[PDB]
Amino acid sequence: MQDCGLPPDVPNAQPALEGRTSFPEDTVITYKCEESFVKIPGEKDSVICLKGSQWSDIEEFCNRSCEVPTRLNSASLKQPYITQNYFPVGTVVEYECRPGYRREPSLSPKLTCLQNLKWSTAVEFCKKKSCPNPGEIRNGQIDVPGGILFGATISFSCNTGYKLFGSTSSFCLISGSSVQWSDPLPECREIYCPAPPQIDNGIIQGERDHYGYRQSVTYACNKGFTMIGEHSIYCTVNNDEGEWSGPPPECRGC
Amino acid sequence: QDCGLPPDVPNAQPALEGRTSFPEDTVITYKCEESFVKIPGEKDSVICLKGSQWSDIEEFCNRSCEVPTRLNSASLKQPYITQNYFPVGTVVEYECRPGYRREPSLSPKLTCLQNLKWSTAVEFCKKKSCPNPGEIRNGQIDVPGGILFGATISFSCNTGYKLFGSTSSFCLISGSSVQWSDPLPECREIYCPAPPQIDNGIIQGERDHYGYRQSVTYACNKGFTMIGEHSIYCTVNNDEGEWSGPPPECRGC
To answer: Outcome of altering residue 49 to R (chain B)?
Structure first.
């Protein structure tokens, strides 16, 4: 009769019958691989109802493959693997470095599917690129807690008596074809105390324009006056603010 | 042949020894009464002569000031320093003691007043001053009460420095002048012990010396995690250098 019966049973595949058990000549039925199975490229996945109520031949076309290789932050799959989904046991793919990573020549950039149905153990074939030497800050310091490779952070500080002007930290980020420091080296500026106080019936010996950390100002009473107090005071510096060690002396008469 | 009572001399009293009759050749001496002093080169005694007659005697006492009161700034000059006769109008001169100096604008002279009193005293001899104390590098000098003869000054070293030498000085008289009893002390920077090294970590740009408030920053080697404070600083536990706390630790992952 001009009709075929059920189509052939294909291992690990299920045919789409669409709610019927009888099919007319020239009917084309397509099979879909079952869960945990992927179709083999370059193979037939359907049958056809020919004359004599006979279905065309079909061979197993499903496997049995790894999952798509897991996403790496250091390397991307090369072509043509990057567009593939069929990875039977034994399949080996190749990677290439992303930015800002570079090859580690001693290590292979290739992975394999386990019977296991699992990709081989991952190694660091693509390593983090390094940022330039951070250099130095005059009168300050650079804190490098964890190297200077891509993704690293460094902080800046100014020695006692200096104030920091600029950025307080920098990060090694990817910059086009390489990796560079997010922010330039800041500046450590000398902190000045307020102008020293004058005193009644006394003077400051050779008063300077600016007074920095620990610098001192010496006092002297005018003729006929007695000094009561510290002969000199010095510049103290805390929390980036200058402040004199204490009050200036007094010149009492007479 | 015995004389009777000796002559009455104004402002003087004779020493009679309770006697009312005196034999020939008896010599009686008079003592000036309160406030009076005998006049140098004058007779103060009489002698009983023949004819029961006393020898003549004239007033020999002049009202006089007392020996000038002692001053600590100056001393009487010669010859006043050895004198006791100071009638009204007498002026004496002083000279400075040590360690005092002359106040050029003033007179170093005193006059006995009509009321038998020395004129008002002024500061003609003033205390000398020791030289300017100077400066102590990284330290301070406290002058609580001037730098004249007898004054005291103290020394101190700023935070982070230790005082080596004298802690005070006193303006003493030294021969022909006044000088400070002690020389300036030195204020020397205190250093903390060398900062400790840590397993599997380093000191970022270590220095050969670390003073007060100076810090040392640590960093762990690739593959280790730091546990504790990243940097420590040099404190001063008087008068010693000491690190703020323990260095961090690097734990292997």
So the answer is: In WES(a) antigen
A224 touches chain B (CB under 8 A): no
Residue B69 phi/psi, 5-degree rounding, is -70, 150
- For A219, residues 6+ apart whose C-beta sits below 8 A from its C-beta are A199, A202, A203, A204, A205, A227, A231, A232, A233, A248, A249
Instruction: Give the minimum alpha-carbon distance from B129 to chain A in angstroms, rounded to a whole number.
Output: 11
Q: How many CB atoms lie within 10 A of CB A253?
A: 10
One-letter identity of residue B139: G
Residue B75 and residue B124 in contact, taking contact as beta carbons nearer than 8 Å: no
Q: Which two tokens stand for residue B241?
A: 């250098």
Across the strands, what pairs with A163?
A: A189
Q: Would an 8 Å CB–CB cutoff place B217 in contact with chain A?
A: yes
Contacts of B157 (CB under 8 A, 6+ apart): B136, B138, B139, B140, B163, B185, B187, B188, B239
Rounded to an integer, what distance in angstroms lies between the CA atom of residue B93 and that of residue B108? Answer: 6
Q: Quick count: other Cβ atoms within 10 Å of Cβ B252?
A: 10
Q: Which of B105, B127, B130, B140 to mutate to test the interface with A (most CBs of A within 10 A)?
A: B140
Question: Identity (one letter) of the amino acid at A190?
Answer: E
Please tell me what resolution, in angstroms, this structure has.
2.5
Question: What count of other Cβ atoms lies within 10 Å of the Cβ of residue A61?
Answer: 21
Say yes or no for a CB contact (<8 Å) between A143 and B217.
Answer: yes
**Token pair of B44, please?**
């103060």
Residues 6+ apart with CB under 8 A from A92: A110, A111, A112
Amino acid present at A176: G
Q: How far B236 CA lies from chain A's nearest CA (Å)?
A: 15
Neighbouring C-beta atoms of residue A66, cutoff 10 Å = 23
Task: Give chain A positions within 8 Å (CB) of B204.
Answer: 141-144
Where residue B167 falls (left for φ over 0; alpha for ψ -120 to 50; beta otherwise) is: alpha
Q: Do A141 and B217 touch (CB under 8 A)?
A: yes
Whole-angstrom distance, CA of residue B106 vs CA of residue B123? 7
A window 70-99, beta carbon within 8 A of B: none
Half-sphere exposure of B204 (CA within 13 A, CB side): 25
The letter for the amino acid at A156 is F
- Kindly list the residues from chain A whose CB atom is less than 8 angstroms away from the CB atom of residue B233: none
At B30, list the tokens: 């008079």
Say whether B113 sits in a helix, a strand or coil.
coil
Q: Quote the CA–CA distance of B157 and B137 in Å, as a whole number.
A: 9
B111 neighbors B89 (Cβ within 8 angstroms): yes
Q: Domains of chain B, with CATH numbers?
A: 1-63 (2.10.70.10), 64-127 (2.10.70.10), 128-190 (2.10.70.10), 191-253 (2.10.70.10)
What are the tokens at B215?
A: 């810090």
Any B CB within 8 A of A134 CB: no
